[PDB]
Amino acid sequence: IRLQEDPDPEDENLYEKNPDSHGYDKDPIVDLWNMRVVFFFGFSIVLVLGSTFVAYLPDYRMQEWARREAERLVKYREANGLPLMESNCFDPNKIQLPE
Amino acid sequence: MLKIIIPTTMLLPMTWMSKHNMIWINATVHSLLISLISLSLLNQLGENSLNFSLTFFSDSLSAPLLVLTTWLLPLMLMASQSHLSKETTTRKKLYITMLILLQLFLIMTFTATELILFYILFEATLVPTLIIITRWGNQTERLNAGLYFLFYTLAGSLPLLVALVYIQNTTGSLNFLIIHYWSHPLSNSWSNIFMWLACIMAFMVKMPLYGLHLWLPKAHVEAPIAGSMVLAAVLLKLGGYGMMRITTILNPLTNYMAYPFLMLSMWGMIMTSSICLRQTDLKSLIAYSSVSHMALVIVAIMIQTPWSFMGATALMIAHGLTSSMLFCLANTNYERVHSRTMILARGLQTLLPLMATWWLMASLTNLALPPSINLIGELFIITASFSWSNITIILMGMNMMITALYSLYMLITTQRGKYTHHINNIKASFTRENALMALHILPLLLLTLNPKMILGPLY
Amino acid sequence: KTLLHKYSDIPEGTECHRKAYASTSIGGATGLIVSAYSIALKPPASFLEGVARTGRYTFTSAAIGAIFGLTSCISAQVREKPDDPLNYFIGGCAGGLTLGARTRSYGIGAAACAYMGLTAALVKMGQLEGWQVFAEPKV
Amino acid sequence: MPLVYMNIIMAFAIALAGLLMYRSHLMSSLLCLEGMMLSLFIMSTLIILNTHFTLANMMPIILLVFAACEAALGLSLLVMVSNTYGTDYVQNLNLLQC
Amino acid sequence: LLDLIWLETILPKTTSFIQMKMSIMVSNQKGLIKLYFLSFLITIMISMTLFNYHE
Amino acid sequence: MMSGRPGRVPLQFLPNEARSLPPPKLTDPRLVYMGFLGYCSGLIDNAIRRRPVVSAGLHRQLLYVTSFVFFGYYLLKRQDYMYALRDHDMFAYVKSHPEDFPEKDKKTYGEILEEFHPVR
Amino acid sequence: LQYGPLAFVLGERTTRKLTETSKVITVDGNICSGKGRLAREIAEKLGLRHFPEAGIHYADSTTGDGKPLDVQLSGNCSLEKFYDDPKSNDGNSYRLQSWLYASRLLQYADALEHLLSTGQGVVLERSIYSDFVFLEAMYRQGFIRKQCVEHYNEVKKVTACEYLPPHVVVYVDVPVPEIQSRIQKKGNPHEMKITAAYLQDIENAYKKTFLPEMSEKCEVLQYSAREAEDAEKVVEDIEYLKCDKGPWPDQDDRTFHRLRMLVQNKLEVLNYTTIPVYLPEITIGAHQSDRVFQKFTELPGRKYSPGYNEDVGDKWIWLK
Amino acid sequence: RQWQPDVEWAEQFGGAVMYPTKETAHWKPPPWNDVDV
Amino acid sequence: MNPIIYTTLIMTVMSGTMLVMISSHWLLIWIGFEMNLLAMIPVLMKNFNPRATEAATKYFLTQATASMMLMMAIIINLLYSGQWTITKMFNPVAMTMMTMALAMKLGLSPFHFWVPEVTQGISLQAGLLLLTWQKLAPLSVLCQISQSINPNLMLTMAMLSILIGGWGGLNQTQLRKIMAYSSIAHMGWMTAVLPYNTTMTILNLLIYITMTLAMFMLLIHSSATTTLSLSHTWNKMPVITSLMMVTLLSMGGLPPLSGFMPKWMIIQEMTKNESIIMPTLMAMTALLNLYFYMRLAYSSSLTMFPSTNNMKMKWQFEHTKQMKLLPTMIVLSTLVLPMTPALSSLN
Ligand SMILES: CCCCCCCCCCCCCCCCCC(=O)OC[C@H](COP(=O)(O)OCCN)OC(=O)CCCCCCCCCCCCCCCCC
Ligand SMILES: CCCCCCCCCCCCCCCCCC(=O)OC[C@H](COP(=O)(O)OCCN)OC(=O)CCCCCCCCCCCCCCCCC
Ligand SMILES: CCCCCCCCCCCCCCCCCC(=O)O[C@@H](COC(=O)CCCCCCCCCCCCCCC)COP(=O)(O)OC[C@H](O)CO
Ligand SMILES: Nc1nc2c(ncn2[C@@H]2O[C@H](COP(=O)(O)OP(=O)(O)OP(=O)(O)O)[C@@H](O)[C@H]2O)c(=O)[nH]1
């Protein structure tokens, strides 16, 4: 008989014991409670209040701040008349060119 | 970051101290709670990383990745109590312990400020994953897979070790900050090339890169479902995360010493997607799909372009969420039929109406349908690569054509068609399987509205 | 390291006959060492079989050194660039091909070209840059 | 360094080579063993007497009295290996193949 | 041909075959004391010899 | 290294001149880390002897952490000593051999020419 | 503490406690020879420690509560089903022989351990040297497979060599016609069909090797059925020997310390009975072994180390 | 149930030398108790 | 052996080793090695089985040969300088001569063929003594003369030892042979850094030591002598295999499991010495040790193996050994990576 081994187990249909089984556990009452708490701290607690939390996070990358200073620059540099965007950022006066 | 690590560590006694059947509930609810605290870090300041201490720091690169890992932790837990329930209390308790030790290392890895501290935990993820694959893996070949997995990534990581310690003695500090500010031009000396190879090869192996990619079809095919996703959903991204971080000292040697990898990747994606056009095994089909999408990120990273980097991280997380999901799809059908072959179980839309949907927009997300962030990731890489070279589109564009043919092919063969006559053990799908699918789909499409939280520091 | 000093003294791509001569001596001595160990750890039959095994190991090693020595030097002459590590690479594969001929197997020769070709490039790689395989205590 | 000084030195080398290869006999192997210490006792003796190291003359006798602890244990091992296997032949010491 | 015939034979199987091939020889010692000491005698001789371990 | 430092009396675990250092605090994270090691050993001990891991030999558990935390404190003081000792004679050598420690010119990036490599 | 190296250093000897009543007297012979009854009388009058026939449930008898455990939890082989079906494909034949030999070996250690710690002689039914006769006969009738004979041999060679032999074996010589008449007198529902050829092959296996083997190692005192009933005669018979043969008379405190070291440790005694020789009759696969071990572990007493089970009422477990 | 190594798997890991060869075919595993006028 | 005789026998073995570490005179060093050999042999000859006699004879012949070969090297030093102290020797020939003699007593270079066999024949308990305590005294002397060591010779000894340590262990099934080949590979790891830093050698010593008793004494508790015999341990003692597996993982050197600490610091220290090909090669071939480490780990806890019917008997009884020092050895050899800056304590 080759080896004294157990036969292949039979797949258990959770609906066979309790038709209202919910695939979280064999025992019905905690099976029910696992659902209520997985859905709660998951579909609702993090997927809704978490979603609005990240959605309502304060200004990311200072995007609003970047816009507000932007027009102040253009309004300044359009009023005087000099070009609104210099080619080089670091001032060549402050730099020391070798040779 | 101690607001995340400490509760994760304290959750380890939590599971072991729990009762007989309450382990799944308490572990799930608190892990989900840990996920919520992780979302507190999504706000990245203007141009500075959210440096907390010398030990731990976070920026817009690890901010989405961290919450992906914490969010993942319930999903393996929600995907494990099916086959694990037929086991002793200790072994189930042990299984939960490993994944929590897994995420703890992952949380520490992404938040590490020092490349050595990055390095230690970066290899340390092998230890829990190896035992998970070997112990509870439901197959025979898994024993060969564990050796294949462990050595392959270590064979690249060990040369990495000598690279970092060399940097420490030569440049000075080794943390992520000083390296960036004190970065110096790397010469073209042949020693610098070998240091470039050492500093890079370890990360490419875990991506993987075409050729150095055979450990995915071994590991993923017969890994346990819970271990399959994490290895597919983040551990591949772990190799990705180091790619941005360590390519701050490898300039400008990146421009010349990248051509072999670009050619290996830009050709591998066509070849690996051509693998996917025909796979007898559903899980192997998904694993090779991960190779192609990851090969996109290798191209993305190696160009070292602003647009390329934001597309890289967007695709990196987006692929992880959908690749993990598709693995859950395989586990459900494999559970009913107790096999992995494609054609054995077919016409499953008629038998299971809702799973027909779940596998449907899973395929669409895998297809980079706009505006799903899979598209906003792939499309960015095309634009960056096209700027790098006009012929990149011929290959990388053809990927989206090949990616479509196989993606629907598994949808055609399994879900659509005629129901298998002899198969009669397929019961109605439990709400756990349906819920778990929603825990993946909803955050994906929800995050589509705000890609700025996934586009990384370069955004 | 006089035997190695012969190879180092002759500049690459010049005086090829002596460059091959140094390689043969390096190969033969290396083949003699492993042959003596093989005789020791695995005692063969009557001494004629012992010298027969010694003949094989030395001849293989001498052949590998000889062809590698020629190819590494004559190629630098033809291609007019001595610093290129590719010089040893082809010579490394060239020497690797001889092993397949001596072992009577294409697979072993192919593997030798794959590996010994790379190492020969790496050996020249250190000579150009200044790598120290055995660094003295410095710190 | 005088001619005789290395007449012992080679004698040690010959004794070492004799012990470093076994012909057929463990007793003959042991004979080269304390032969090596004999030259070792001898070689030390010339050094100490020549240099007038008035306090190092201790070392030779204790070099012998401690090499004996090797020898005494030496044959006593052989008597064990030559009563189970019967013969002092050293080719019978291959029973530990695996 | 490419994935699971060659790419599995270039790196993995070649290294595995080499390690196994060099393992079968270095661990198949004959257990005879004669050959062990004779192996030392070469090592002692040659160590104090042509590697020039004196300068 | 310190090996033969001029005045290193042998077999001296914590030399008396090391007390000038600030002693490690009782709640040091390093010190309490090996209190875990004592605790972590406690679960291991009765596990091999097949005993309730958490609730068995509470006296044994108390000994393991206490013994670990004790030897740890003295080991920690030795740890702080040599590192401070490593630093002490270090700086002393610097102003003892100034010729090997020149001060590089503090020239701002205004003059420094670092070549720029475009990435395309 | 128990006998350790410290105790021997500080005074604990064995030859001081040894005396005349220090004889291993194993009663052996054919099935249904009344040797068990005679052993009680010999031990009773001599003041010797009797040892009842160690069956399948002897290991559980010696430890725990002594109550029999389930066959799945102990043995996985029944002499009942043994007798019912000779050549069962499940291999109950050899599995029983290996388990029974293990119980015989365990009983032998208990005899020596008790003998050395108290100084009273021992009498045991059959012996670890009386267990090969059955398997050899069981091989001749085809009751087992050939490799069963081999596997039993190295188990004996690795284990039986270390322990000492007895001094005076007791044999109740009973012929085949008598035991064929005797078996039907009991009426148990598995011994009423014992094949006469089996009991026939038991006795000549005793003839050819059993007595000659231990004759050089111990005295052999044979008795017929009539000569065994009168236990008064044999009592004086065994008190008039020398037991010079065998290594037992030459036994100093040095060897005694090592022997008491091994018998007081009830793991090394039976350690080599589980020698990794995979045979179909005795090898248990991973799944079946794992399930049974869970069944054994969930049983009371065996959950933790002895004296550490709260399920029975062990108090002060927090400071033990 | 998951795959579990059988006796055939053990025999692959059960020889005196795991990588057998003609030079080791004759080799035999050591005895278990190490005992060989 | 009478316990009082055995205790005093162990006692002089420790005293012989201890004398080596505390003796300035070269002659006293040879005495300590002589006493250590003089009492190591009877411990191996405790079981009194032919394998033990084989192993003791091999061990004695190679150790006694190196002992008097060691004595010759001292005399040459006396011949060329007239000194007796251990500071820095004064003759290049004597440098190699004693380096060969010292190294053979550790079994790392081609002078290592005894190590796998001598531990195989002798018992497991005495094996713990051979591969842990008999490996401090020769290492102690080598650290003292590390100034005058010849790097070219010494590092060639290190490379061969690690290469042979991994390759030899791949082909072995007797777990005693596994340990010795692993020990040789570890010996090459520690032995490579003496010319650079003796302190890192010490740290590699304690970590390797604690690891060996952790593995050896766990093997004692399981009472197994082959991989197949170790396989059945899962059924009787499932816990033992659980820690035994984590010890094997650490033995490979996978972070954060301590045991990666020496390999890490060894790589770092040589890297400071501009030696960077050398650390890579040993680190790369360190994976060879991991293969049979996983292989042993695979068929002990990770995958259950076919047990035996008589194994049910073993469950009923309990272990009698008090497994002293086993628990704290596991923890100290598996979790002390965060406490690495204790390197300063050794200096
Ligand atoms: C730039 C300066 C140098 C210029 C010249 C080039 C270098 C020297 C020449 C080439 C040396 C490397 C090539 C191999 C030489 C040895 C070949 C040899 O021993 O072959 C015999 C044998 C292989 O065949 P076998 O496995 O026995 O199968 C047939 C059985 N009937 O062998 C064996 O079975 C044993 C395994 C092979 C022998 C051991 C390894 C030998 C090589 C070690 C490194 C040598 C490096 C030399 C150069 C640097 C140092 C000077
Ligand atoms: C670095 C990465 C990780 C590395 C290590 C990985 C370890 C796991 C994997 C090991 C590799 C092999 C695979 C697993 C094999 C397991 C084999 C085994 O023995 O399993 C069964 C075994 C039976 O245990 P048993 O004797 O029944 O006792 C249970 C508790 N009474 O089970 C056991 O023995 C397990 C028992 C668990 C007991 C743990 C007790 C923890 C107590 C925590 C207390 C916390 C208190 C918190 C207080 C907070 C306030 C201060
Ligand atoms: C499976 C094989 C490996 C897979 C691929 C991994 C990556 C490929 C390259 C691996 C390189 C490993 C060693 C690199 C260590 C760090 C490199 C570094 O810091 O750069 C140095 C690069 O220098 C080197 O020489 C590094 C090693 C070069 C390659 C030679 C050894 C590595 C290849 C063989 C071993 C690894 C392969 C496994 C073999 C079994 C710079 O130092 P330098 O040379 O400028 O030093 C100053 C002076 O010039 C003297 O050194
Ligand atoms: N396998 C095995 N079975 C044994 C051994 N000793 C006794 N038995 C079994 O013990 C049981 C009873 O034996 P019987 O001889 O019938 O017992 P009885 O009728 O009391 O007669 P006596 O033994 O003469 O006292 C049978 O199942 C025997 O096979 C032994 O050494 N090995």
Side-chain angles (χ1 to χ4, degrees), chain B residues 268-281:
Chain B
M269 53 189 339
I270 306 297
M271 301 285 328
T272 36
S273 43
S274 186
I275 288 304
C276 279
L277 250 197
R278 46 196 289 104
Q279 275 306 279
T280 66
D281 191 341

Side-chain angles (χ1 to χ4, degrees), chain G residues 27-38 53-56 79-80 82-83 93 96-98 100-101 104 125-135 138 152 172 174 179 182-183 186 188 191 194 198-199 206:
Chain G
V27 304
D28 322 279
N30 224 327
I31 275 62
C32 272
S33 56
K35 58 174 100 62
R37 158 263 165 169
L38 162 77
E53 194 75 88
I56 309 276
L79 84 84
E80 313 89 272
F82 185 182
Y83 291 156
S93 70
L96 165 142
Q97 197 75 12
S98 166
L100 268 167
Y101 173 50
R104 305 249 163 285
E125 269 83 319
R126 253 36 169 284
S127 77
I128 88 163
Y129 330 93
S130 310
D131 201 274
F132 82 107
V133 47
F134 291 1
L135 167 141
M138 151 169 318
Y152 179 74
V172 183
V174 173
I179 50 60
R182 231 205 285 283
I183 38 64
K186 304 101 184 74
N188 310 130
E191 55 82 25
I194 311 301
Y198 185 52
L199 298 204
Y206 274 107

Side-chain angles (χ1 to χ4, degrees), chain B residues 162 166 191 194-195 197 201, chain C residues 129-132, chain I residues 276-277 280 284:
Chain B
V162 199
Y166 183 89
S191 75
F194 274 103
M195 161 175 78
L197 275 196
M201 211 56 38
Chain C
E129 174 90 343
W131 303 347
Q132 323 147 49
Chain I
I276 57 185
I277 287 90
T280 308
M284 280 306 248

Side-chain angles (χ1 to χ4, degrees), chain I residues 19 32-33 42-43 89 116 124 132 135 161 166 202 245 251 253 276 294 299:
Chain I
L19 177 68
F33 292 144
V43 189
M89 322 194 312
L124 215 57
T132 53
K135 303 314 234 329
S161 40
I202 313 289
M245 179 276 301
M251 241 178 303
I276 57 185
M294 218 59 46
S299 42

Side-chain angles (χ1 to χ4, degrees), chain C residues 4 7 22-24 26-28 30-31 34-35 56-57 60-62 64-66 68-69 88 99 103 116 123 127, chain E residues 21-22 25:
Chain C
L4 181 173
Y7 214 90
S23 86
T24 51
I26 294 277
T30 325
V34 48
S35 155
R56 307 197 289 103
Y57 295 178
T60 56
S61 81
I64 296 156
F68 159 78
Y88 274 26
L99 197 290
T103 38
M116 320 190 30
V123 158
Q127 252 176 6
Chain E
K21 187 167 102 92
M22 294 189 155
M25 46 171 70

